[model samples]
Target chain A: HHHHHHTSKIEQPRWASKDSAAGAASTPDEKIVLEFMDALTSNDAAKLIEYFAEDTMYQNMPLPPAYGRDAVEQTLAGLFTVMSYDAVETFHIGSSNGLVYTERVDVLRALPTGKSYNVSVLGVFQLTEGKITGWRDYFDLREFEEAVDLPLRG
Target chain B: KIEQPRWASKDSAAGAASTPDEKIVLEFMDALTSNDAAKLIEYFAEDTMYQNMPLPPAYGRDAVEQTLAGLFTVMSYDAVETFHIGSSNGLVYTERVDVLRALPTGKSYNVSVLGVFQLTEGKITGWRDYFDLREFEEAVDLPLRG
Candidate 1:
């Protein structure tokens, strides 16, 4: 007796589907960015860094974009040392095709001086798998400078 | 049997949730296109805060009206286009580009902006517009800041 067997159909591993299902239930990119913002206010560098990819591009309004995760970390670290941010209310936090747009009025208190600065800000983030690949923020540098009583750049 | 209301367009309740804030912004833009100070001020609260990023903020409805009037006197604008408008909580975010004609120079310029507005009870309480000051200065042929 001759037996003919066709073995072309391959079933995807059950665990592969389960992994994606579990990942879907985890935090979303919007939630992750919100958490990163929260961590930023609290000066939690480690927590904030977790939300950024290895090669991140961070831009602060009109300024040239800064690249790499290390730059992001160092920039935040430097800013946190002299400034403390208040919990902000985002006007709009919308995301589409892995991009998040946030409009906010950021309130920051300058250390030592204890001066409070309230500035309107618009931010965009390009995220990949819940990590920020690129971030750009827009605000009036003059207003910020006057508020903080410091020159931001030489 | 239920009859659809005449006013119920595609963006009405029948469709996906209509964003009321988006409508408000569109109305505001329509008002802006008219270039009437009175019409523009109607969208603002009694104590509105209107800020143009490069300059100091203008406070109160009166100031907002005056600022708009001053801009209208020197510049005529083409129909502004809103590239994106999104809202959450009580704030609306907009990305827009305004085509302007400088009255003195008669030169056309494009001003790209990202604006945020905070609304309460259908009135805009706060508005902030951010754009590149350098681009604006160059567009109008103003001297660069030293």
Candidate 2:
């Protein structure tokens, strides 16, 4: 018998779904990115890191970009240590000209302060050969600061 | 003279749009660029909802117009340049850099934005911009909220 240790609550996309299915255009690439973000609820940095290319760059705006998977690992590990995230949303998904966009609010909980923040985020993603090459999240840094009351990345 | 129904399509004076939906938002920039409150007012539906995130949502054509007019009084609209545009879930979203020059401070400020729109019958029924409030405050030296 096979044993499953971790309980998975990942929301998988329905098959045979198309862009118009959502009342708009959808792309094959958008579905791949959705699968990536869907696993964010797992809070496993190493598990999520596998989706990026070795040299992929990630940024949380007004802050500098984390270049390469090595640097991204540090950033993700740091975030997971301090925050546990809920299913991302109030998000609108979009894709065009080989790029994907997400207008979302990340519902995050601070482990230390025991506070929560619904950080409104604009995420832009670039993928090549089915692996994420670049990602940036544009949002108010102050909103995050105000929510966690932490000296983040300072 | 009687006014046209709020749900009526815009006049044919504007140029051709990319599609039925995209046209409404694209032409809206023209009205916004004009910097005239009345021009901006014509694009919204009677019950449109407007929100600039990390902030409160504002409602109604008349209500939104009042705020836009008040905003114009405070700052000059420099530009509403589009960086990228797409749609999903029956809605249109824009990645834009909205530039505004402070009236009193005399310096330019810009914020990275993801402005999402919900359109009905060529009129915007719902809209929201997700951006950092601090960008405006730090640049213009003013707080958007008290």
Candidate 3:
């Protein structure tokens, strides 16, 4: 049996079963994306790692994945550790060219200084079997840096 | 035993209810148009599962209420242009252009969104939303001088 660590105590959404069952159905792709986000915001280190396809690739606003899951995980580890009071909210979902688009607002407290910030972001997802295999996001890194009380070095 | 009132046929309900899934979806649009949190909540089921497809899901009605309050605190509707909708298996699909102007910095943002809502008995049980963020940030016009 494979053992996976519990990342956070937060409840999983009701759509999980459907999202898992429907698999690749376009109807449920949105739910799958949300499940991934729930994990992302909760700092569910293990599951966040799992959400990516073995060959998962991420392209962010100011940075590229650099490599595959290993690099992505390193970036996420730093991100989750530095955040608190985290939240992500979606305003809409659409699909084009086999990619899913999401408009969202994310709020969190940056670490050490623990300054809080609210950011509006857009997410693009590529999925298979009800799991996101790749993701790209766009947002104001300036707001993030400001919230974290850091200077822009990128 | 008294006879039960004839329940409206499913087809009749689909046809006659002014609040068709499409109309219910439109109501949500209207609610967004006005930023009426109370009215938005009314369109959701008691055990409503509200999820922003791009975000995480909020399981109960109360959570949705709390979340909405926080959202309303920071921004107001800029206007939703180019709205469209479609349907399948009690689900409704909608797409719109959302223009948002941030209150704190007074910066304006325009982005397109697509929302898929799962409905049961004319009420939204869940929703998944999608959009792009890069456009929003680039479109945001402001001075971030600290």
Candidate 4:
């Protein structure tokens, strides 16, 4: 049997919060996504909106896209009011060409029902000048519906 | 700077094999649009885990097929518009807008989906889709609230 000891702690990925302090030196796309994550985890709607372009396209999977920053803000505001983030762990964050992608697991609490669930998210963002021109997130709708105890209506 | 995926080209033919990861995703999407449960199941591994994101995960190909059968009964397939696809280390990522029609209702809806896939030897081992459930419910006119 061969035993080997490693002396170094594993360095966090660029998406990790600890790395955010050095964001000034990070890639522009990396910084943009990191700031977006901060806004998201902190439930800072205004900060989140600041990252969006004036005519941003923000979409959550399975729904119609919300066009323009105002529409995006409104949609996010509704969710922020009802659901608050408890924990968010960004596993992988990278930029390919000009596209930014993120994989995250988020736990949120429903304000009215006090129910919580973990949402597995995959996000694709189109960024320009450190502003998000288009943002799309994918996750299972079933988990979120059940988490908030949304009643079925036909 | 990472190189763009070969399959990202709009001129790429459907049958043209780019990479194993990309090939599997194209085949899976084709199987889905084909509306054949058996064909769709063929793309998954025996112990595949398929998740619709908001719902619980379905384990095994059989369970995934069963879930698909249920969905097929409610919606008819149309087309999947792929905006972007990138692959890294056998994991394929896709940004797509899926269009489908509600059964009998004749209501058409576009569901923007983000899909992450894990593949092994051209078979999907794990697949997860994320989208807004509220939009889906509203599109089907099956409002969740009574």
Best prediction by TM-score: 2
Candidate 3 Cα RMSD (Å): 13.6
Rank the candidate models, highest DockQ first.
2, 4, 1, 3
Chain A structural similarity (TM-score) per candidate? Answer: 0.76, 0.80, 0.74, 0.77
Each model's C-alpha lDDT? 0.65, 0.68, 0.58, 0.68
**What TM-score does candidate 3 get on C-alpha atoms?**
0.45
User: TM-scores for all candidates?
Assistant: 0.60, 0.78, 0.45, 0.68
lDDT of 2 by residue, A104-146 (tens): 6577766777666667677777677788877778777776777
At residue B114, what lDDT does model 4 achieve? 73
What does DockQ come to for candidate 3? 0.07
DockQ of each: 0.12, 0.26, 0.07, 0.25
Q: TM for chain B in all models?
A: 0.80, 0.81, 0.74, 0.82
Instruction: State the displacement of the C-alpha of residue B95, model 3, in Å, after optimal TM-score superposition.
Output: 2.0
Can you give the lDDT of residue A134 in candidate 2? 76
What is residue B53's positional error in candidate 4, in angstroms?
A: 2.4
The TM-score between candidate 1 and the true structure equals 0.60
**Candidate 4 local lDDT, A10-43, one digit each (tens):** 3343222343322231367866786777678778
Cα error, residue B88 of model 4, in Å, equals 2.7
When superposed on Cα atoms, how far off is each prediction in RMSD?
A: 18.5, 10.0, 13.6, 10.5
- TM-score (chain B) for candidate 3 is 0.74
